[PDB]
Every structure is written in structure tokens, then in C-alpha cells.
């Protein structure tokens, strides 16, 4: 009665705001979501985002480029916020990622009631299980969907252990 | 050695920014920090913050009221960032808390080298230990004290 969703976001954060570039979400059932916001300003991107994140984004004709309102709607459907399953959000650390995701609904008060107010942290789980040796980091390091997938992979390894 | 800090914040957030009202930090050794920012704008507070948060704040002439720079400097001292301690940060449902804390320094890349880039989620630990029974308002130092209390019970 509970579905885990593994997510990662890319963004531009300056100490004041967090402007969403992209989000990838993978459910443990094989479903995938990925989108790139049409509303972030590429000029604001720092040097590191300009070289590592932006070049990996889809061509501007791609239907993966969506408005923020559209991404919100897409996520309400993808997370099945009106279905009977409870939702568990998982990310490597949450924090900035959780806020970026949740800001798609505006303030904290506006988040759909079934969306958890916290993200479970894979990093904490990994450490809780004695820091198992893990597979190496994939090649497309800063693509949000590739990242999310890899997080589901690691979650399965960490939890499918003998313990 | 490793030192755990438990913290909580109050703020005004509007889906874009997080304007820090106050922060409370408690170390495992018993040390406590609390401050209220002289830089948030109470006019911008929603009705919920107006009624539950602001009236719990100290009177205006209390030296608990500090600038954002003073709070940053206060925290670098309280967390002992110049020492050889390793630091763990812990909060309960703390995604926005972690951002609020980090924004005291700027982007997260401005964080001092020894402060961790993530805050451990006390609610995840709780559920991982089988959701043991925890005891029984929106004052950040009282909240932070209470997280340590719960941590000690969860790990007892
Ligand atoms: N029921 C609520 N309505 C509006 N904002 C809230 C609510 N609960 C928590 N918050 C926000 O999250 C911050 C942290 O809350 P707390 O640590 O629960 O005292 C508050 O300063 C509020 O801005
Ligand atoms: Mg990320
Ligand atoms: Mg709190």
C-alpha cells in the first residue's frame, strides 16, 4: 500500500532561491518521469552548471521541456496523489532537492496532503547499513533521470542485502 | 571525535525564499544556542506564523536578537568549525531547515569545509527503529531540545 519514488533535481541556487532546471523521478515499479523547466534563466547559471549540467539537456524542440505548472500537473498524476497508496520520497540527501520539488506547488501549505513533507535520504540509509561497497558512479553524472535510476539501483542493493 | 547537533528553525517561506526568523541548536554534550534574526520582515508573515511563531519570540531589547552575520559567526563558534571535531547535523523533517541554515553562509558551496552538506533526518531514524513511543511550542530552541530528547530515546 506504499510506493517509493526516487528523485533528483538540477537547479541554480544562489543563497536566496533555488531555480529548477530539471527533475527526474523513478518509481520502484519501473515507471519513469523526466522534465526540464522552460522557466529557468540559463544566463544566471554559474560556471559549474554551464559545463556539467546544461550541455546534457535535451534539444529545445523536445517535449521534455515543460512549464512549471505542467511539471506540477505531471507529478500529481505520476505520484498518483489521489490513489490509495501512500507515497515515499527518496533521494540521496533531499534538502535542496526536496525544496525544489515541493516548490512546484508554491508554499509548504499548498503541498498535496498525501505528499510527504520529508524525503528519506539514501545517504543516511547507506551509512546505517555499515557503508557497503557500492558500484561505481555512472558516466552521465549530472542528468537527473540517470541519477534517479541509479539511486533506485543503490536502494535495491542496500536493502536486498543478507541483513 | 564526532559531535551531533540537533537543530530547528522558524521562518517565513513563500515558495521562493526562506526568510529565517529563528534558530535553535543543541549539541549532544548539552550545549545550546538560540537566536532570532533582526533581518526578517514580520509584515511578510502569514497568519499562521503571526499567531504561532511571532508571539513566542523574545522582547525586542533581548540580546537574543542578532543580525544574520552575527548568527553565522555565532554558529561557526558553537559548531567549533576550526577544531578537529567531525560534525553531524540532525533535524526532524528538516529539508527547509537545512536550506535555511546553509543560506546563513550563501550558496551551499560557501559552507565551511567541516560542516556537512546534508542534515540527517531524525524521522527516518525513528521509523527505522520501529517507531518507538515518543513523548509530548513553536519555539526553535525548545523544538531542538526535544529532537535531542527523541534521538536519545530512539537510540537508547
Ligand atoms: N501548519 C503550518 N502552516 C504554515 N506554515 C507552517 C506550518 N507548520 C510549519 N510551518 C512552517 O515551517 C516552519 C517550521 O515549523 P516548526 O519547526 O514546526 O515550528 C514555520 O516557521 C512555518 O513557516
Ligand atoms: Mg541534485
Ligand atoms: Mg521544525
Residues A154 and A118: their CA atoms lie apart, in Å, by: 20
Under 8 Å between Cβ of B3 and B18:
no
Q: Which residues of chain B are within 8 Å of residue A120 when distances are taken between CB atoms?
A: 121, 124
Contact A121 B120 (CB under 8 A): yes
Q: What residues form DSSP beta bridges with B4?
A: B88
Q: Strands of A120-121's sheet, edge to edge?
A: A65-66, A32-37, A18-27, A2-13, A86-91, A120-121
Establish if B124 touches chain A: CB-CB under 8 angstroms. Answer: yes
- Among B16, B138, B140, name the best residue to mutate to test ligand 1's pocket (greatest count of ligand atoms within 8 A of Cβ): B138
Under 8 Å between Cβ of B9 and B21:
yes
CA of A105 to the centre of ligand 2 (A): 19
Closest by Cα among A110, A91, A92 to A102: A110
CA distances from B148 to B8, B143, B156 (A): 11, 9, 12
B19 lines ligand 1 (CB under 6 A): no
Residues B156 and B144: their CA atoms lie apart, in Å, by: 18
Under DSSP, is residue A31 helix (H, G, I), strand (E, B) or coil?
A: coil
Strands B86-91 and B2-13: parallel
A109 lines ligand 1 (CB under 6 A): yes
Rounded to 5°, the CA angle B140-B144-B150 comes to 145
CA distances from B137 to A12, B140, B153 (A): 35, 8, 20
Who's near A77: CB < 8 A, 6+ residues apart? none
Residues B28 and B148: their CA atoms lie apart, in Å, by: 7
Cα-to-chain-centroid distance, residue B2:
19
To what resolution in angstroms was this structure determined?
Answer: 2.1
- Return the CATH class of domain B1-156: alpha beta
Q: Is A66 exposed, middle or buried (0-12, 13-18, 19+ CB in 10 A)?
A: buried
B143 lines ligand 1 (CB under 6 A): yes
Superfamily of domain A1-163: Ribonuclease H-like superfamily/Ribonuclease H (3.30.420.10)
Contact B121 A119 (CB under 8 A): yes
Length of chain A as a residue count: 163
The 8 Å CB, 24+ separation contacts for B83-88 are B85/B1, B85/B2, B85/B3, B85/B114, B86/B1, B86/B2, B86/B3, B86/B114, B87/B2, B87/B3, B87/B5, B87/B114, B87/B115, B87/B116, B88/B2, B88/B3, B88/B4, B88/B5, B88/B116, B88/B120
Task: Find the CB nearest B15 among A95, A107, A117.
Answer: A107
CA of B129 to the centre of ligand 2 (A): 28
- Residue that is written with C-alpha cell 540580546 in the block: B63
The residues spanned by each domain of chain B are: 1-156
Amino acid at each position: 500500500s506504499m510506493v517509493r519514488y526516487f528523485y533528483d533535481t538540477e537547479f541554480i541556487e544562489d543563497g536566496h532561491t533555488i531555480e529548477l532546471i530539471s527533475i527526474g523521478v523513478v518509481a520502484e515499479d519501473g515507471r519513469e518521469y523526466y522534465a526540464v523547466s522552460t522557466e529557468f534563466d540559463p544566463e544566471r547559471a554559474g560556471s559549474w552548471v554551464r559545463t556539467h549540467v546544461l550541455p546534457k539537456l535535451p534539444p529545445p524542440a523536445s517535449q521534455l521541456w515543460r512549464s512549471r505548472q505542467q511539471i506540477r500537473l505531471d507529478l500529481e498524476e505520476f505520484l498518483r496523489i489521489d490513489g490509495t497508496d501512500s507515497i515515499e520520497l527518496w533521494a540521496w540527501v533531499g534538502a535542496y532537492d526536496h525544496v525544489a520539488l515541493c516548490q512546484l506547488w508554491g508554499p509548504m501549505t499548498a503541498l498535496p496532503p498525501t505528499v510527504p513533507r520529508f524525503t528519506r535520504e539514501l545517504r543516511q540509509l547507506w551509512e546505517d547499513r555499515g557503508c557497503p561497497r557500492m558500484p561505481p558512479r555512472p558516466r552521465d553524472v549530472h542528468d537527473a533521470l540517470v541519477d534517479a535510476r541509479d539511486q533506485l539501483r543503490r536502494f535495491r542493493l542496500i536493502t536486498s542485502t543478507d541483513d
